[PDB]
Symmetry: C5
Subunit: 311 residues, 5 copies
């Protein structure tokens, strides 16, 4: 088999469409997601023209091996897609209607800067390489682009699934390549992070601040050190759900900042004890009373600054 | 091969059945379950009809490649099913009896609102796409729907395996699609959650309340802070067995509420110490004595409210 | 190809045998084990009979596709077995000797009631479905049932590998099915549980009982609470190696009971301190002295009761 | 195709060789290792003999399907090897030279008695089953046994890769079987265990012994209990890297013994406090001073005894 | 098919090129990385030469089976590459242009000495084995070596992708082997290690040094022991992201050194308490005041020494 011949000198247009059936396993650490979808392809092959009068049938059904099929691949996939041909329908003029159902693990970079209040644009890049006899170009059939109503991505809200209609045509290894960008817009369901991570982290921090209403050094050391250890546990828990980033994430910034609050609280607790042993409790009382206001105030202002810089 | 031709204009009815052999790996985080079952298919192909008295044979056995077989797929599967054809039998009138044994990983959303006292309806969606020559519709042969007595799903009780007899017929990408809903009703075996999570979580909370019978601030801080850390460990353990939900689960609600009880207990312990240092122990005694009743009473009432809102 | 015709009306007997080469990956949580074995099949096919004199051969070798072979399947497997045909030999009377080497992941329920001092009976269910032409029945060739001397299952002792000679013949989807039960009896190597879990768990519990020889409330709170946290860690460790069961396991029962001992120890420590503060130490001394005997005695008797109920 | 006929009655000798290209993933828990190697096979087939003078060709190249090839398998593999034929060459006398590149996951038991200062002998068992026409025997071509210079097994030192030249010939299921033992000798790189596990474990134990220079019961309880919890963490960490063994490992023996030292240290701390409360500090001082010498001395002697019993 | 015959006695030159499409999953523990790339091959086959005038074409497109193709393999891969042929083109003089898209898991040793401020040279080794008929040698077509601009390796910066132009020609089992070294230079994005591991580890260590401004032994024991436990948690966390090395890593050296600082801090805290109990506090004050300077000074100098030895 060889590609369809050009009537003039034009490239062969392969109309494409992706219909999402299932979306699952969005792995934040791996920056991957699994997809199960329909891939529709359409091109004119005049060598397959037929008379419905002679053949009896109005539409011809072919096996993939019997006819020429464009070598369509995905750019951003771990391994080649697991594909099963559903139908190959050829109409009298030679217009081929190809339909396959596929499953693939897609590589798509994620921006964690606003985590867990982040939104992402997942990409599925469709590609075709031009052959010697003729250049192959990709197009989007908007009528064949969509998603099933039941498509759910655990821990995410699906906003839209659209395609950039204009392909990216470029030279690669002395041949033309036609690339299409299918975009799946999603927003993270931040809900569960509030009762599971955010609020427990705030509770332990506020518990450490009870040391500002205590003169007992040994109880203060227990309050600040124990809650710090619990904060380390939450820091470790958060970083297990995330990849290592060359930038600070919103959660990472708050988590890091809270360490400074624990560190200054230890200094205050140390300074307070030192002065009381030195028979200067009036002075220790001034520092402790100021800390009761300073710690929640500086914490509120620093969080307003952080929220502003990130959102 | 081509589909059987219609006698009038009727769609081709493909009778279906699923017989469960094995049910395993219900993954709560992934919202998947693995299945090993028999898939039975039945349709009329008049081009295959034969005389019973002339032929001598009452049934004719065909290889899948020798005859036309409807392209039956599962909607909610990770990858295409691993299938092996068991038998193909044709009766004199041309009624085809198809049987295959398959294995598949099924995507089925789970409602965790009542966890670990939750019940689920797992779905297996059967689908057929119509051809240009004729429309293909699915039907349920109730005699061929069932499950093996030995079918066990670890940590779950299997209630029923039924099929919604009426298919969901709809247009998808300019062709008819016939969808059947096979439902596997299950209820969670909550047993183990009681001695492993619920009771140990209650024991540590009740241990924190012993601080209401102690005047020792240093020991009280140790009691409330250490038990809170153990509660954080149980919160982390519970969330590792569950996916992130855009709603509160029953267990999640209790776990979150218990943090408030630890927080108020720290306030009480702080207030008690502060008053004793201020030479007001008669007062600290009134707050401590009230706390001995208030804490278990508010805990009981809040749990009755939560159980009512969730069940 | 079609099944061998009956001389009278008798069912076709397929003699079976399983020879274990490798046993590995017994997953307690998944209730699975992997197997690598020889599967031997034997049946009479008169159509393949030959005379040794005119043929010059005492035996005839065939390719699987050249002759009829019974569709033998495993009931309790995750996916269909990975099989490679080793040999197909035909004797003059048409007696076929089939041999394949296979690998499979087997689903077999485990009884954890006596864990880690439990014994299991793993099952490998062989099955054949009858055809319209004739009924196919399975039999056991005891001479072809066995295991390699080097067969080792990590963390387990292999007792026996036998087959229930009488098949379970029953109707499934209007066709008769012949099922054989191959049983692999194993006993858990409990050894490592003693120095790694049992003894460390007993040491921390006995350490909490040193509080009965101390009047220091602050030190007592530290002793009981810290060891309880270590007991929670062991409870979590044990439950990670086990699936969730709708019954109590022997280890689970001891682990749960130990929480009650920690809870009563906290009450004793609280009662002791309360009385001392109330200027009643003579009385606290009576409760503490009684606890020194009561705690180890009640622990010994409760363990005798538990061991009796479980073994 | 059929096997080469014997000139007299001799068995067919299949000369073998394994050349290791890659060694990776030595899984201690699973007792497996992955291998990527060349498998070389050589045997005489007189039916393939040719004249080198008239043919003008010294060697003939065949495709696997064109000639008879012995069914060579591995005994100790999870699944059948993933093999690709590299070359088949036939000399004028009919000597066939077969070469394939394969990858396999090998099951090989490990002796953990001396862990992490252990050495292992990994096995790769080559096997051939005799055919009815003739007996097949295996041999080692030492000229075709070896390993690539770059072969590295992470966390291990590769000593040698040799083959036991004499095959193990035995009857299995009424046929002869010829088995070869390829041995890969390795020694564990214990280096990292010293700064990561051994020394931190010794530091915390020596920190618990500072309680022998303290009269403060509350601080002593904190010293011994906190370090014991850290020892439990190291015990858990060590057991996660190891399978469960029906014997004591060297590390396991030390870890278990250290618990006894923590237990006796708690007794000493309890006895010391009890005597001081009883107004007997002169006596408590004698026990504490003796403990300062006894604890490190008994620890040193017990470790010498353990090292002697294990090495 | 047979290899192209030599015009004189020259070896067959196979020009190669690798164009990286995707780089993902750099596993530090496994010392592997996954790659998705184009593999280009070019060689002269005179038997395929044609006249452009006579044929009416300037290029000839073949199927892989129709012509001779060199058996090109990767040395350092887990399993054989997953490859799909994209195009095969023949010029009039018999110059073959082969293009395939492949995916492979590559084994490449990593030097962790400078972790997490390390740089690596990942290798992809291309190999060809000579045939009895002729010697095959590999070459690099620099015009066909490169990478896509979007190629990202999570947690790493990609510096360059170059090839060592001269192959490593050597004998392996009496046949010439031609090996090419494709090098992917990467540098670790150390950023996240600073707020997640380095700084929290420094904060807890500096918190342990507050004990040098405290005379309270019980609070000092709590300060040093609790922070040491948190340091053990960070040591465990770091070692889970790394394989076991027969050398010290930069992070491993700092982590190990910090244990010595905790150990000496416990000695100081013990010595201080012992002297105060012995009625020698003036002396304890001299040791404590010296420790306030000695600990941060020795820590700074030891870190300068370590940074110098490692970088
Ligand atoms: C009687 C005073 C009641 C104080 C209630 C505390 C309000 C906490 C609000 C939390 C918001 C979520 C912020 C945490 C610090 C709490 C201060 C501890 C109480 C001080 C006791 C003084 C004794 C007179
Ligand atoms: C009033 C003294 C303020 C001390 C501020 C501490 C500086 C910490 C620098 C951190 C660098 C990152 C290095 C940690 C030691 C901190 C010493 C604790 C304070 C001593 C109390 C003395 C009471 C007069
Ligand atoms: C510790 C600090 C507590 C965290 C503070 C909340 C973070 C935040 O401010 O979150 C804000 C995001 C809103 O995001 P948005 O509109 O999608 O972003 C795009 C916005 N632009 C385009 C205008 C830049 O989510 C929320 O509605 C937060 C609701 C949860 C409150 C958590 C309370 C605890
Ligand atoms: C901390 C709070 C302790 C937890 C309280 C039990 C939760 C509950 O109330 O559980 C209730 C569920 C019953 O569920 P149901 O009838 O299937 O629900 C559907 C009901 N509708 C249709 C009427 C809405 O389970 C049980 O029988 C609980 C038995 C275990 C007792 C645990 C003691 C600890
Ligand atoms: C002598 C009084 C015995 C108290 C027994 C405690 C009952 C606990 C019931 C648990 C139910 C499961 C609820 C936990 C609080 C326990 C209070 C501790 C005792 C108070 C000491 C006062 C000394 C006179
Ligand atoms: C905390 C309490 C400590 C645990 C007590 C041992 C459990 C037990 O009693 O174990 C009993 C099992 C024996 O089982 P069996 O004969 O196979 O069972 C079938 C018996 N029938 C058929 C008669 C019912 O193992 C042992 O030999 C235990 C030896 C290890 C001692 C552990 C010391 C710590
Ligand atoms: C001088 C008394 C020595 C006591 C030795 C302890 C025996 C422990 C046996 C463990 C069995 C395994 C059972 C744990 C409680 C230990 C009691 C603590 C000592 C009491 C101090 C009294 C000071 C006179
Ligand atoms: C806590 C106790 C600390 C552990 C003591 C070291 C273990 C040991 O004694 O290790 C010994 C092994 C040597 O092994 P070998 O010669 O291969 O054995 C085969 C010997 N036969 C054939 C003679 C029986 O390693 C070493 O060289 C130890 C060097 C590391 C020192 C660790 C310091 C901490
Ligand atoms: C002035 C005494 C300095 C003591 C130095 C401690 C040596 C530690 C050797 C570690 C080997 C690795 C062995 C751990 C016990 C430590 C003893 C604590 C010091 C006792 C204080 C006495 C006050 C005069
Ligand atoms: C505890 C000790 C704190 C860690 C000290 C930093 C490590 C270091 O010194 O890191 C040095 C590397 C630079 O590496 P380079 O130039 O690529 O190496 C090759 C250099 N040759 C060729 C000259 C040998 O990173 C940095 O730029 C450090 C920035 C991070 C600061 C961390 C603050 C905490
Ligand atoms: Cl693809
Ligand atoms: Cl399917
Ligand atoms: Cl099977
Ligand atoms: Cl094999
Ligand atoms: Cl390869
Ligand atoms: Cl050489
Ligand atoms: Cl050569
Ligand atoms: Na084609
Ligand atoms: Na068909
Ligand atoms: Na304390
Ligand atoms: Na057959
Ligand atoms: Na062959
Ligand atoms: Na070829």
């Amino acid at each position: 088999v060889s590609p369809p011949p050009p009537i003039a000198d034009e490239p062969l247009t392969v109309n494409t469409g992706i219909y999402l059936i299932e979306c699952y396993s969005l792995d934040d650490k791996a920056e991957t997601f699994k997809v199960n979808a329909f891939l529709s392809l359409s091109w004119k092959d005049r060598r397959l023209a037929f008379d419905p009068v002679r053949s009896g049938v109005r539409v011809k059904t072919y096996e993939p091996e019997a006819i020429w099929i464009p070598e369509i691949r995905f750019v951003n996939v771990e391994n080649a897609r697991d594909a099963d041909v559903v139908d190959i329908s050829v109409s009298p003029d030679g217009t081929v209607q190809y339909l396959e159902r596929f499953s693939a693990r897609v590589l798509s970079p994620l921006d964690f800067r606003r985590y867990p209040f982040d939104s992402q644009t997942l990409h599925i890049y469709l590609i075709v390489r031009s052959v010697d006899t003729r250049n192959i170009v990709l197009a989007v059939d908007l009528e064949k682009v969509g998603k099933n109503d039941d498509v759910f991505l655990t821990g995410w809200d699906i906003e839209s699934f659209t395609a950039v209609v204009k392909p990216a045509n470029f030279a690669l290894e002395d041949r033309l390549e036609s690339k299409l960008d299918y975009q799946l817009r999603i927003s993270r369901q931040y809900f569960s992070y509030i009762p599971n991570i955010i609020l427990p982290m705030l509770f332990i921090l506020f518990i450490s601040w009870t040391a500002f209403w205590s003169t007992s050094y040994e109880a203060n050391v227990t309050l600040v050190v124990s809650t710090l250890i619990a904060h380390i546990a939450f820091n470790i828990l958060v970083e297990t759900n995330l990849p290592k980033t060359p930038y600070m994430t919103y959660t990472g910034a708050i988590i890091f900042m809270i360490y400074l609050f624990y560190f200054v609280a230890v200094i205050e607790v140390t300074v307070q004890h030192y002065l009381k042993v030195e028979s200067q409790p009036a002075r220790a009382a001034s520092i402790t009373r100021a800390s009761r206001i300073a710690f929640p105030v500086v914490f509120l202002l620093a969080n307003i600054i952080l929220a502003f810089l990130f959102f």
